[model samples]
Target: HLTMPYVMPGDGEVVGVGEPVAIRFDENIADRGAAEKAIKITTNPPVEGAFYWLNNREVRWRPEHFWKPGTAVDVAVNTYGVDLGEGMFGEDNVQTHFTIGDEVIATADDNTKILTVRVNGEVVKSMPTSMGKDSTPTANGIYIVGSRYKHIIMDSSTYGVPVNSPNGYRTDVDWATQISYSGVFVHSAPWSVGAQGHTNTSHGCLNVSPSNAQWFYDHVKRGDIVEVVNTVGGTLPGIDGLGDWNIPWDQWRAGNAK
Candidate 1:
């Protein structure tokens, strides 16, 4: 029997416009078409959307454009007792409801070393930021905000570079917001105050002042947008966290399971 192990934007939660409905199954689905058919999504002030399979056991759904504020979304995976081929059957059904809040977008420019934020299309905050240096330049593209942490340990050793190495050091970060699965984030770096507005100094992260980072962390939530531009690095991969917007609309639809 197939079971849904996880779904993003948990039931009754409020999320940002860039959020996607992601589902993960405990078993590999052979009849992806049937599974896709079993899933239903409805939104107030209806919007066109599509599903893209990340793998045999994972799939995600997103609207053609960012959802408008106040949009209510409902998702139902009515796969209970349904045949999914390979003698597999759906073990149960699941449902979730979420709403979109205000539109929040943050744009980080490498050349100017500035990060500007807007809410409902109005400029709200502009702060100095120091992004990755040449050796570890930050990627350029749209990124959906992920997890947030009040305080967290960031160790280079976690990604392979030992602490004793020249480019490695373990440190504690505050007001960190995750942007990529490959260890990229926007966080407070008090030590880089002098460099924040003038030079790129971090190891692929957007470094801001303590006050600015805390303010940013307090205002944004999961599914918000963060775009990095004018960087030397390549565009972020779509598979990385919520880099889905990096994919063009036509190409996004072309990747659908249906």
Candidate 2:
């Protein structure tokens, strides 16, 4: 039977403007076209969007642009008893509702070594940052903020780099805000304070002052946009976290099952 494990922007949750409606199935879905047909999305004051399959078991929906503040979204997955192919059938229906909160965007410029944050279109905070160096440059593109942490262990091995290697080190990070599933983050780095505004010296993270990191951590929420520009590395792909905005509208529309 078709089994769903979870859906993002869960019921009653208020998320950032860039949040996408993500659904995860417990088992592989062979009939993607059928599954997409059964999913329903309704938005107040309507917006145009499309669904894109990240993998066989994951699919997401997002509008052409950032969601408007105060937009109300409702989702329904009505697949019970529906054919999902490979002898599998949908087991149950699921429903959820969420609201889009204020618009919060953070722009990190690698060349200037600065990270500017805006809320409701006003510049609220501008902090110096030390981005990744030449060997491990930060990716450039729009990124949706994912998880936030007060104190977390930063391990290079988690991303396939050995801890004892020349470019590897495990450290404790504070006021960390995750922007990518590939281990990129904007977090505090007291060790790189001197180079914050002047140079790029990190291993791919946006290193900022402790105070600035704490303030940012307090202000931002899940699904907020964090755009990195002018970096040497290539643009981040849509599959990395909620890099959905990186995908052009034309391409996004073409990906829709409907």
Candidate 3:
């Protein structure tokens, strides 16, 4: 039996594109999944972000690189007087907001011959990346940034590919950011040396540097937006499957829990 009102993310918070926004709360809630229903994010111009629980008291949300700067954001939580486990309850109404005042930068992937990077509609970086080949074929869809881990282990077992195969970059690089669950990430690919500027050769990630990944990690906020374009597979949007690029603007706004 529960005895506390689970704390949830509330309104009126600011988040930049690519930046990580987290739910701030105390440790009264036990079930992270059940309490997730109480968190919500809303923004102007419509950006999509991924949510990940940092622990029992925190859950964060972020979009790819879709948030337009100078945009306003709203977040709300409700945890007042709800049953928990030991006669405890939440006390905050959870409401806050902030504005986006920066240019949006992002990478678009097609899994073929293009990995276009843009900053406020200006092309900044463009490179080639290998999405998945016949076997995995890169899950087609829009994905958002949920978290950015500066150091992490890169695994290739996701797509059933061995680390030492043609489809795998297969090495642990630094500044690994979480964009999706399928092992696709914005990480260092010094091994992608030959193919980065010329051809496609990855498991379907926007290959950048440990440096650029770091900059991106620092520069972006939770609701920044990104888009993956011109791929050869089926395209699905929303916070659906393993993330990829950013979801389309209109659809992203539809998922609001208000």
- Window of ten residues with lowest summed lDDT in model 3: 1-10
Instruction: Choose the strongest candidate by lDDT.
Output: 2
Q: Indicate the TM-score of model 1.
A: 0.94
Please report, in order, the local distance difference test score of every candidate based on alpha carbons: 0.88, 0.89, 0.55
What's the lDDT for candidate 3?
0.55
For model 1, residues 1-258, the per-residue Cα lDDT tens digits are: 556546788999888999988878888888888887888999998998888877788878898899999999999988887776687887888899999999999999998999999999999999899998998889999999999999998888987989899778798999999988778889999999999989999889999999999998899999899999998899988877578888888987787565
Model 1 C-alpha lDDT versus the unseen true structure: 0.88
TM-score, model 3 to reference: 0.60
> Which of 1 and 2 is the better model by TM-score?
2
Please give the ranking of all candidate structures by TM-score, highest first, separated by commas.
Answer: 2, 1, 3
Per-residue CA lDDT of model 3 for 109-181, tens digit only, reads 6544455556667877565554444344445555555457767767675667776785554466676656565
Give lDDT tens digits, candidate 2, residues 166-256.
8897989999999998889889999999999899998899999999999988989998999999999988888776688888988877885
User: Which residue pairs in candidate 2 collide?
Assistant: none
The clash numbers for all candidates, in the given order, read: 0, 0, 42
